Amino acid sequence: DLRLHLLLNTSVTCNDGSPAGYYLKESRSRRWLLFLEGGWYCFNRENCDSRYDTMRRLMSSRDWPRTRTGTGILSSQPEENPYWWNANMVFIPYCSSDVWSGASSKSEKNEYAFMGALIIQEVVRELLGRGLSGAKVLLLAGSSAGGTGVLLNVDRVAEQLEKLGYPAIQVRGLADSGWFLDNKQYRHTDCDTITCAPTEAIRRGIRYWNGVVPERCRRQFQEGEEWNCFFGYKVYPTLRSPVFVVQWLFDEAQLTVDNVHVQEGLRLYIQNLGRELRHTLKDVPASFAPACLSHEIIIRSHWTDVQVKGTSLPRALHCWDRSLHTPLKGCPVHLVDSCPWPHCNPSCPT
Ligand SMILES: *[C@@H]1O[C@H](CO)[C@@H](O)[C@H](O)[C@H]1NC(C)=O
Ligand SMILES: Cn1[nH]c(=O)cc1Nc1ccccc1
């Protein structure tokens, strides 16, 4: 089990001012896995108020359990986790509703705190006194909103460790189901909560959260256009840390924001979405992109079952490790399906 620790710096908070935190299982290993939880976001008073009543664990630590069980890539059992079962394991709950980008406290002017970027920094700082100072590799992983969080924060963790005097820790990122397209939608609605497209919702969110993006991406798109850096294919080329990208070609969250819930028009729309996603990954050398309609994530216990070209994700991640010690005989790291319809890969989740 992973044991809860609330942050000693109680000024770094969840949305409602309760302290943020992390769950830890030590492996007395020089590998550290820090995993970012997902769970959408909120971007104004009214839809944050709604989220506070029916998704409170995503806005508050007041009700968190004292322990959690690690699953999938967070499992310590080699049967379930062929990749990193003997690593030090950290699960960081998502309680900031800001795609891990915020840097704003609750105050007389702000009903909620949005501190996702500062939560990650404070977790890292507090872990350095519990053994992270001796690490050889720190893998910042995440699913869904947490996968986009990896892309927004992995270079900031690398910079933080460099400035604290730990240049020998290699920082890497693993972004699962956080690689979205700002594409044409299947049906169109002007921007309330359910009609607001991600580009418009994220533009408003950044202002509401005091959201922060990677500096080299911010310098490209400049003031008012930071929303671009929340889209993987736009932020990835600006990053210096090695990042492995896991993305379903037909991700259920992407289709939902595209107002898709089969005749010829919709068939062509779905096939073109798969082709577009494949295109954005052509020059991403470490990636795993199966042709499935899914919302399943890498902390699920049966994560080893899906294969691309006969290679599982735990194997691809191991080959990635070897590549960071020129391609490796029988140990591939770039695995993108080419077939054009959901479940044309037989290993897709059932
Ligand atoms: C607590 O965290 C805040 C936000 O990062 C920071 O400004 C402050 O210096 C921290 N306090 C201590 C004692 O580390
Ligand atoms: C928030 N979230 N939830 C997911 O499942 C994926 C994301 N990231 C995202 C990035 C840009 C635009 C829209 C969403």
DSSP letter string, 161-177 = HHHTT-TTPEEEEEEES
Q: Does the beta carbon of 11 sit less than 6 angstroms from any atom of ligand 1?
A: yes
Asked if 265 contacts 312 with a C-beta cutoff of 8 angstroms, the reply is: no
First-to-final CA distance of the chain:
28
**Cα 229 to Cα 252: distance, rounded to the nearest angstrom:** 21
**Cα 327 to Cα 267: distance, rounded to the nearest angstrom:** 36
Neighbours of 103 (CB within 10 A): 17
- Residue whose Cα lies nearest atom 13 of ligand 1: it is 9
Identity at 111, one-letter amino acid code: E
- If you measure from the C-alpha of residue 230 to the centroid of ligand 2, how many angstroms do you get, rounded to a whole number? 8
Q: Which residues make beta-bridge pairs with 311? A: 308
- Residue whose Cα lies nearest atom 11 of ligand 1: it is 9
SS3 120: helix
Residue 66 to residues 21, 62, 160, Cα–Cα distance (Å)? 11, 11, 29
Identity at 19, one-letter amino acid code: P
DSSP 185: P
Resolution number, Å: 1.7
- If you measure from the C-alpha of residue 194 to the centroid of ligand 1, how many angstroms do you get, rounded to a whole number? 36
DSSP 316: H
Structure determined by: X-ray
Of 177, 180, 191, the one to substitute when testing ligand 2's pocket (max ligand atoms within 8 A of C-beta) is 180
Give the number of the ligand closest to the Cα of residue 150: 2
- Length of the chain equals 350
Give the number of the ligand closest to the Cα of residue 121: 1
SS3 125: helix
Asked if 209 contacts 41 with a C-beta cutoff of 8 angstroms, the reply is: no
DSSP 24: E
**Cα 101 to Cα 57: distance, rounded to the nearest angstrom:** 18
Asked if 119 contacts 96 with a C-beta cutoff of 8 angstroms, the reply is: yes
